[PDB]
Structure formats: C-alpha cells, structure tokens
Coordinates of C-alpha atoms in Angstrom, one line a residue:
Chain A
X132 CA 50.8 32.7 -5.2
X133 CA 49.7 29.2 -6.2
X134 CA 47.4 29.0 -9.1
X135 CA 44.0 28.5 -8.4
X136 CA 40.5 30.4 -9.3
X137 CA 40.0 32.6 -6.3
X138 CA 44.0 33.2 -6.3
X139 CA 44.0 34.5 -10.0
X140 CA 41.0 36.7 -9.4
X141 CA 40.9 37.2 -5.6
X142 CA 37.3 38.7 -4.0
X143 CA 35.7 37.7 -0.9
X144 CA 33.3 34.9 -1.8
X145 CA 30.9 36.5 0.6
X146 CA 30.8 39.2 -1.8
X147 CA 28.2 37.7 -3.6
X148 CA 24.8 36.0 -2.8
X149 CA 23.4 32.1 -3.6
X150 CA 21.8 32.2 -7.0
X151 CA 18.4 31.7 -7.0
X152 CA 17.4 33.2 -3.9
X153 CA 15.6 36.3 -4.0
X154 CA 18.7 38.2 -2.7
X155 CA 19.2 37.7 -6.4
X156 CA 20.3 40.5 -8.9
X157 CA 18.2 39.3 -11.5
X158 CA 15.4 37.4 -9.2
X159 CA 12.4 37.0 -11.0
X160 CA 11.3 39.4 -8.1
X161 CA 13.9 41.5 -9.0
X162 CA 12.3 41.8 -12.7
X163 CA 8.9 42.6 -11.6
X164 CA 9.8 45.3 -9.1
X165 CA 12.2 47.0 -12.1
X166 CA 8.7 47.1 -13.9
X167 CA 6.8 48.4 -11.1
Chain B
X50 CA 46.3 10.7 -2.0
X51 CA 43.7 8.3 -1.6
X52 CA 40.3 9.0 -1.6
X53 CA 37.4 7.5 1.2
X54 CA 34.3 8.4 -0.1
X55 CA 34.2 5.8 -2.8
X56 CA 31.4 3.2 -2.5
X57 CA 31.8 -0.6 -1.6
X58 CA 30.2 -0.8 -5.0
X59 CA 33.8 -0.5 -6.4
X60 CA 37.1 -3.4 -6.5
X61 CA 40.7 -3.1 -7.7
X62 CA 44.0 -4.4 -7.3
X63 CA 46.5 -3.3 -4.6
X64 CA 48.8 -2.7 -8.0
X65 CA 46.6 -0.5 -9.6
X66 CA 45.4 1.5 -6.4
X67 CA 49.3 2.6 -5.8
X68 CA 49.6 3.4 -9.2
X69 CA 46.9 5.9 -8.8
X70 CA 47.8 7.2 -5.7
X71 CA 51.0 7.9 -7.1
X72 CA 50.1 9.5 -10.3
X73 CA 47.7 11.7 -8.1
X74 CA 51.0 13.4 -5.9
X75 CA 52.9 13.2 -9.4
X76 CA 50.1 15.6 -11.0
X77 CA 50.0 18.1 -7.9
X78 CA 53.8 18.4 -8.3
X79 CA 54.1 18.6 -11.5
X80 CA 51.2 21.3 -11.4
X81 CA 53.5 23.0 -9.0
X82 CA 51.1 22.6 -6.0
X83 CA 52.8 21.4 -3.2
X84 CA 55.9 23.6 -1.7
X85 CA 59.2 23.3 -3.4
X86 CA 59.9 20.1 -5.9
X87 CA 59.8 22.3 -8.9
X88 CA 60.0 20.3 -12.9
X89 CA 62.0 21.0 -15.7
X90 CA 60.4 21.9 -18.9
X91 CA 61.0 19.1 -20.5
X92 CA 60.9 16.8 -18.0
X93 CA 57.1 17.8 -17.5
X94 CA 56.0 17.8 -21.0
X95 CA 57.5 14.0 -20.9
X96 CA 54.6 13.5 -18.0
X97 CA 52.0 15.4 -19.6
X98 CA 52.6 13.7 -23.0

C-alpha cells in the first residue's frame, strides 16, 4: 500500500544473508571453492 | 516529530524547533504517509516548490 522499499518490491528480508560473512554468495571463500 | 537522540552538543530556539517539527508532519502528509489527509496537486507542488 504505502510507498516504501520493501512495499514496492516485497521479499522476506530473511531471504538473504549479512554481506561479508562467509554465508556469502560471492565470499572470498566462495571464489576459492568455485576454483577448487 | 521530534527527535531525542540529538547530542547536548546542539542549541536552538523554541521558534525554530516547532518550525521543524512541523515541517517534519507536513512532509509525511504530504508524502501521503500517514492515514487519510490526502493533497491536491497543486497544493503540494506549492510545498515542494
């Protein structure tokens, strides 16, 4: 209804992980096991 | 409309504290946020201008 972020594109915030954790998508982690 | 967290670091007139209190509910209406109280085209372009 009103018009805010979350109300124009409405997802579950715990749909996502913290950045920079190693939970991270793109985790430096993340880069080294996509090499090994 | 009013906000606590500022720091004792910071003085102002009475006059000047309403007057931004009151701008602050003006905005939020006039960005249609509380219930009801809705602004004519015009009307709101005078505000914003």
């Amino acid at each position: 209804k009103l018009p805010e972020y979350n109300q124009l594109f409405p997802e579950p915030w715990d749909n996502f992980c913290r950045p920079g954790a190693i939970e991270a998508l793109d985790s430096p982690a993340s880069y080294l096991l996509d090499l090994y | 409309l009013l906000d606590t967290q500022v720091s004792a670091k910071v003085i102002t007139s009475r006059l000047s504290l309403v007057t931004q209190s009151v701008q602050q509910y003006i905005n939020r209406i006039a960005l249609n946020l509380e219930p009801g109280l809705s602004i004519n085209q015009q009307e709101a372009t005078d505000w914003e201008e």
